[PDB]
Amino acid sequence: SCEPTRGCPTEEGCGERFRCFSGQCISKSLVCNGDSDCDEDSADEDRC
Amino acid sequence: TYVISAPKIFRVGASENIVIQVYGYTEAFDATISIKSYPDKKFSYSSGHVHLSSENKFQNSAILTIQPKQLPGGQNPVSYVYLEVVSKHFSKSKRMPITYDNGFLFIHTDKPVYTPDQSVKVRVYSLNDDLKPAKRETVLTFIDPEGSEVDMVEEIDHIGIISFPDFKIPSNPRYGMWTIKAKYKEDFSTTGTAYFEVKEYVLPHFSVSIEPEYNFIGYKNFKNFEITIKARYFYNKVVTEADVYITFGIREDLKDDQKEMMQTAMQNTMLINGIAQVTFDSETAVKELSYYSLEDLNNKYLYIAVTVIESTGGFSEEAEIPGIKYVLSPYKLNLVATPLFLKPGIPYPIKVQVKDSLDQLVGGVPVTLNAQTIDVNQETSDLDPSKSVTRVDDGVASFVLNLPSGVTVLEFNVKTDAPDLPEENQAREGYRAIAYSLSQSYLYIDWTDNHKALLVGEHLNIIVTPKSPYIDKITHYNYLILSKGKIIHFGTREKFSDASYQSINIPVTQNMVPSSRLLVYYIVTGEQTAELVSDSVWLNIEEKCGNQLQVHLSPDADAYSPGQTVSLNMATGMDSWVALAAVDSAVYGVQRGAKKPLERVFQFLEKSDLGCGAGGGLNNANVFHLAGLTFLTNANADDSQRSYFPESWLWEVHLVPRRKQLQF
Amino acid sequence: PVPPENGFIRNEKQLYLVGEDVEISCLTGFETVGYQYFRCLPDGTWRQ
Amino acid sequence: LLEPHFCPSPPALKDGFVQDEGTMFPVGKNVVYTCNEGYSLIGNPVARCGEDLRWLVGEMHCQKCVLPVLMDGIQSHPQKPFYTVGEKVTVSCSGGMSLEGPSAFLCGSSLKWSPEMKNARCVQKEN
Numbered sequence: 001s002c003e004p005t006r007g008c009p010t011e012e013g014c015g016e017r018f019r020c021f022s023g024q025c026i027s028k029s030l031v032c033n034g035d036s037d038c039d040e041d042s043a044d045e046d047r048c
Numbered sequence: 049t050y051v052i053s054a055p056k057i058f059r060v061g062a063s064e065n066i067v068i069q070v071y072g073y074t075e076a077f078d079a080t081i082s083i084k085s086y087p088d089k090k091f092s093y094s095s096g097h098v099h100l101s102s103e104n105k106f107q108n109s110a111i112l113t114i115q116p117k118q119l120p121g122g123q124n125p126v127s128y129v130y131l132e133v134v135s136k137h138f139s140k141s142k143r144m145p146i147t148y149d150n151g152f153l154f155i156h157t158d159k160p161v162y163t164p165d166q167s168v169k170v171r172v173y174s175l176n177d178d179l180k181p182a183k184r185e186t187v188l189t190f191i192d193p194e195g196s197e198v199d200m201v202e203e204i205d206h207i208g209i210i211s212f213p214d215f216k217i218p219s220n221p222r223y224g225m226w227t228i229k230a231k232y233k234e235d236f237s238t239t240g241t242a243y244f245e246v247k248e249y250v251l252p253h254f255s256v257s258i259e260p261e262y263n264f265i266g267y268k269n270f271k272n273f274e275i276t277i278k279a280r281y282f283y284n285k286v287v288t289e290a291d292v293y294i295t296f297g298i299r300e301d302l303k304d305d306q307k308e309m310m311q312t313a314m315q316n317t318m319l320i321n322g323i324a325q326v327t328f329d330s331e332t333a334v335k336e337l338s339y340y341s342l343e344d345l346n347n348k349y350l351y352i353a354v355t356v357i358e359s360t361g362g363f364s365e366e367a368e369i370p371g372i373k374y375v376l377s378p379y380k381l382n383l384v385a386t387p388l389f390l391k392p393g394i395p396y397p398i399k400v401q402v403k404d405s406l407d408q409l410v411g412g413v414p415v416t417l418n419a420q421t422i423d424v425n426q427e428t429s430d431l432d433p434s435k436s437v438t439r440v441d442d443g444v445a446s447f448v449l450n451l452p453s454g455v456t457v458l459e460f461n462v463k464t465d466a467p468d469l470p471e472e473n474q475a476r477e478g479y480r481a482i483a484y485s486l487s488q489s490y491l492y493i494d495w496t497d498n499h500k501a502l503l504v505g506e507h508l509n510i511i512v513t514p515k516s517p518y519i520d521k522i523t524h525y526n527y528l529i530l531s532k533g534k535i536i537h538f539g540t541r542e543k544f545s546d547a548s549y550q551s552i553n554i555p556v557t558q559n560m561v562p563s564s565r566l567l568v569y570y571i572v573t574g575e576q577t578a579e580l581v582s583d584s585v586w587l588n589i590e591e592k593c594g595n596q597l598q599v600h601l602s603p604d605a606d607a608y609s610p611g612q613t614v615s616l617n618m619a620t621g622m623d624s625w626v627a628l629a630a631v632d633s634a635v636y637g638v639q640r641g642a643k644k645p646l647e648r649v650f651q652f653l654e655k656s657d658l659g660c661g662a663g664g665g666l667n668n669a670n671v672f673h674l675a676g677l678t679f680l681t682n683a684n685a686d687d688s689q690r691s692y693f694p695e696s697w698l699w700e701v702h703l704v705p706r707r708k709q710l711q712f
Numbered sequence: 713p714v715p716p717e718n719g720f721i722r723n724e725k726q727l728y729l730v731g732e733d734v735e736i737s738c739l740t741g742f743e744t745v746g747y748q749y750f751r752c753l754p755d756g757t758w759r760q
Numbered sequence: 761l762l763e764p765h766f767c768p769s770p771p772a773l774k775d776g777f778v779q780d781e782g783t784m785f786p787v788g789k790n791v792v793y794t795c796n797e798g799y800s801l802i803g804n805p806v807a808r809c810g811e812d813l814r815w816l817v818g819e820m821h822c823q824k825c826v827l828p829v830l831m832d833g834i835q836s837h838p839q840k841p842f843y844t845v846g847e848k849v850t851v852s853c854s855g856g857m858s859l860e861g862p863s864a865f866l867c868g869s870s871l872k873w874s875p876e877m878k879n880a881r882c883v884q885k886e887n
Contacts, residue, residue: 007077007136010050015685019577082788095788115790115806132764139765183801195731195754206800206823207869623797702846710846 018044049571049578050138052081052680055533056658056673058129059150060114060236062177065535067109068098068133071571072523076101080134083112086127093117093129105524109538114146116235125235133680142680145688151176151184152653153230153240156646158629158696161249161637168215169699171627172230172240174205177532177656179559181208187233188212193224202233209627209701221246245639252634254281254290256356256367263404264379265330265350265372267468270343276325277317279356279365282634286322289360294326295353296333299371302349309351310337319356349373367638370406378475379404379413381462384444385497385586389664390483392455393515397496398447400462402438402475411440417462419449424456435465446498457482484583485667490515491568491583502589504556510566513549518572518579520545527552527568529587531560532656533676558594562650563587563657565675569668571683578683584675586662591650596621599628602709610692617709626708630698713750713758718742728752767809775799776822785809795822800869824870834859834882843867857883 017025021043030037032048049071058064068079078100083093093115098108118125128146133139154173162168176182183205190198203212228242260275277294279287293316297309310333317326335341349371357364379402386399398417402410416435422428431449438445451458463476484490494511502508514522525541536559541552554566569582602615618626629645636642659676669686672679678686702710715721718739728734733751738744751759766784770791776799779792786809793805803820810816825843828836828851837850848866852859860883865873 010138011682013140013682013685014577016687021576023576092788094790095786097786113790113792134765136765192731193754195729195752196733197731204802206802 020044049580049682050133050135050140050680051569051571051580052133053528053535054131054144054678054680055530055535056144056676056678057149057533058112058114058144058146059177059533060116060146060148062150063111063113063534065109065111066096067107067528067535067538068135069526069571070100070106071573072106076106077136079108079136081110081112082132082134083114084130084132085118086130088130091117105540107526107538107540109535131680138682140680142678144678148235148237150236151182151238152656153186153238154646154649154652155228155230155240155242156627156629157228157242157244158631158699159249159635160244160639160642160645161635162217162244162246163248163250164217164219164221164246166217168217169696170212170215170228170242171701172210172212173627174208174210177534181205183208184232184236185234186210186230188228188230190215191227191229192222193226194222207701208625211701217246223247245637247637247639249635249637252282252637253358253363253365254279254287254356255634255636256354256365258352258354258367258369260369263408263410265374267343270330270374272327272329274325274327275352276323277319277354277356277367278323279319280322287319287358288321290319290356290358292317292319292324293355293357294328295355296328297351297353298333298338298346299349299351302370307351308337312336318359343374344376346374347376370640373405375405376473378464378466378469378473379410381415381464381475381477383479385588385662387585387662387664388479388481390451390455390458390481391492391664392451392483392490393453394492394494394513395448395450396458396481397498398449398460399444400447401444402464409443411438411443413438414465415445415462416465417447417460419458419460421451421455421458424454455483482666484664484671485579485581487518487572487574487579487581489517489572489579489581491570491581493566493568493583493585497586497588502556504558504561504589504592507553507555509551509553511549511551512568514543514570514581518574522570522572524570525550525552525568526570527554527566529554529560529564529566530675530677531564531587532562532653533658536560536564556589558592560587561589561591561594562653564589565657565659565663567663567672567675567677571681580668580681580683582668582671584663584671594621595624597624597626597704613711615709615711617707618704619707620704621706623706624704625701626704627701628698630696632695635695713760730754767813767815770807770809770815770817773820773822776801787811793820799824825867825873826871828865828873829876829878831879831882845869851882853882858886859883860886 014025018028018031019025020038021041024038024040026038032046034048038044051069054066055064066081080095080097082095085091085093094113096110096112098110100106100108118127126146129144130141131144132141152175156171156173158169172186172188174182174184174186185202185204187200187202189200192198199215201212203210223246225243225245228244230240256279258277262269265273277292279290281287294313295309296313297307299307312332315326317324331341334346338346351371352369354367355364381400381402384399384401390396400415402413402415404410414435414437416433418433419431420428421431434447436445436447457480459478459480461476461478463474492513522543525543527539528535529537529539536557539552539554541550543550564587565584566587567582567584569580571580572578597618597620600617602617608614631645657676659674661674663675665671665674668679668684672686673689715736720737720739722735722737730752733749736748736750753759766786768784769782770778772778772793776793776795779794788809790806790808793807795801800823802823804818805820808816827841833853834851845867848864850864852863860881861877862875865875868874
């Protein structure tokens with residue numbers, strides 16, 4: 001057991017980037033590119 | 049999460065309230081926000097601190113100010129702002145554009161018409177964003193109508209009503225429309241502009257008002273057009289009898305003042321009981337003087353001159369109308385106070401307005417629209433058309449359309465329907481409305497200000513609905529009402545399973561009289577990432593003064609004898625400074641009516657709103673930029689994309705308690 | 713503006729503001745007689 | 761400074777008061793000064809807390825009718841020691857002569873007349 005002193009770090013800001021299933025935020029240039037855009041999963045799929 | 053809501057454009061020397069919200073936790077941690085310049089490293093304008101607890105539900109708002117700490121000189125004086133947040137769990141920075149546009153300048157002149165060798169009594173009303181007097185130095189420059197500057201004068205403001213010395217007209221005046229600008233002269237913005245014309249207002253004998261039956265001559269008015277010419281005295285009494293001479297003419301444009309004209313009339317009519325009306329057909333004029341008789345050929349103004357002389361005594365007064373052009377295309381349509389967006393499943397009101405050729409609303413014209421409700425996934429169907437008429441008093445046509453829950457966008461073609469307007473020459477304007485999302489969550493606020501506009505002191509209820517949320521259990525409701533680009537109050541409510549839609553009660557205040565805006569955003573907790581949904585709709589209410597200043601003379605009579613000693617009593621709610629001005633009703637020259645001295649205190653004050661449109665729009669970033677805000681959160685970002693008697697008199701400024709009375 | 717004979721317009725710029733007046737001088741060897749000033753009218757014309 | 765994450769109550773001048781009251785103010789925080797009823801504000805007026813626990817104050821003062829120049833040849837009407845805002849005074853000289861310039865003088869905000877004419881002239885003669 002431990003006593004929390006400092007606050008926990010929040011998640012990094014995902015600015016103007018379409019988030020993935022895991023959290024890798026990539027640019028919107030790859031939207032509906034018909035390939036492995038996120039490079040980790042096909043979560044987005046952009047209804048492409 | 050850590051959603052920070054802030055106005056889009058900050059004002060220098062103004063109290064900008066910055067609010068912060070937390071997703072909620074069992075531990076209460078403090079937060080801190082600061083105002084830093086372009087150097088990161090190393091400067092700081094001000095530093096505010098807030099406190100979070102279970103009583104405040106982990107939201108708080110602190111006012112921030114921007115003072116003249118900027119570097120003197122340089123290639124750019126603004127270096128707008130860098131905003132930071134100091135919190136235990138989160139810390140982020142973002143730049144935001146600012147502007148020195150703070151306060152308002154109301155230049156009030158005693159007279160719109162000046163003669164050579166005459167004093168110029170003028171006062172400037174200095175104001176802040178919070179409607180405070182904001183005692184500030186102000187310079188006043190004068191510009192000749194030819195474009196050259198005349199004289200500049202500076203004076204310090206101690207009371208709140210900037211009193212200026214009486215200007216003097218040079219020995220060689222330049223007739224025309226002059227220009228008056230005012231600046232704070234050290235470091236500020238929002239320069240005010242006032243206009244006044246120097247002309248000869250020696251004596252208007254009687255006001256001649258030209259009120260035609262119809263604004264612009266149409267197809268039905270081509271064969272017969274009847275116009276009413278009424279002349280009335282300045283002391284509210286009509287003219288008994290007078291000879292009225294009518295003169296017609298055709299002008300190509302409003303800029304050309306001299307054009308050929310009939311030469312046929314010269315119609316002599318008699319004024320009866322202060323009202324006269326005569327029938328004028330356009331066929332004879334277009335056949336005789338125009339040299340070509342067809343309404344398709346002549347697309348140009350129609351100038352009419354009226355000379356009214358009294359048969360019982362030698363007098364003459366003249367009036368004129370700019371022009372009435374025969375246009376093949378009908379009057380144009382436009383939308384006002386109507387968000388061009390869609391809410392699925394909820395009836396979307398449609399408010400359209402019809403304006404004439406030159407910036408004036410039209411009434412009594414039936415209009416209809418054709419709409420096509422399209423499905424999100426597959427084929428569509430045609431929605432049943434609806435037809436209605438526009439009222440002359442309201443000026444805006446009202447329409448309501450109910451759409452299914454599976455509609456994405458809608459297109460409506462509003463066209464006019466009239467017996468004289470053909471199908472080839474018709475007014476049609478197509479538009480498109482796009483609905484609001486990755487989490488499929490939506491938000492809506494109702495009643496679209498059709499109450500109609502409300503007063504101050506009565507509580508209003510607004511229904512919200514989180515249709516298709518990410519999760520059925522919602523933490524809390526968050527809504528913020530803003531006005532003049534500032535957050536006046538921040539609301540909060542709880543969500544229960546009692547019903548699907550909850551009504552929130554929002555108290556109205558005196559500071560929101562000109563206009564207001566409200567936005568309702570709720571955050572959800574996603575299994576991987578979060579996404580919040582917001583929505584906003586315009587807020588239009590009535591115009592009630594806070595001071596409640598009313599002027600009334602102690603003697604109560606319809607008519608007063610010349611030279612009678614009268615007393616004027618001022619009645620205010622709180623202590624305030626008054627600025628009295630006794631302007632004659634005859635000083636208003638023809639001058640296209642000589643509209644009014646100001647006539648606009650709230651309408652010109654509405655310019656403080658940063659965003660445009662009524663409300664609603666695309667994803668949270670676009671709708672917050674349209675509402676005039678910029679948000680900071682983890683989920684989403686925001687993209688910037690000698691006697692007697694000369695006029696005028698009674699130019700004084702006095703202190704007024706709850707009841708003050710003066711004698712003159 | 714198009715200067716009179718001998719030209720010699722000082723502080724030559726591309727565009728003059730409305731109301732600003734520019735003084736013209738005579739080219740050597742000549743001398744300015746009369747009123748030598750060109751004031752910008754509201755429209756594109758000059759006082760001359 | 762770790763990839764990121766006092767001054768006492770400032771005294772107020774005569775006839776003035778501070779908008780925000782507090783025991784301790786953080787370094788860099790600014791305070792706004794106000795004046796009471798019947799007085800005007802001339803100055804910055806903002807005072808700034810420095811790192812040395814001191815308050816940086818600019819040339820600020822708290823300012824707001826009196827008897828005229830009282831020439832032996834002129835006579836005031838009405839003759840009162842103190843004048844209130846909104847009243848006018850009719851100054852004139854002895855018989856056979858009339859005051860040159862404006863005959864009536866109005867009491868302004870405070871210590872302010874529209875013309876002052878401090879010992880300038882009342883009347884030589886009006887022929």
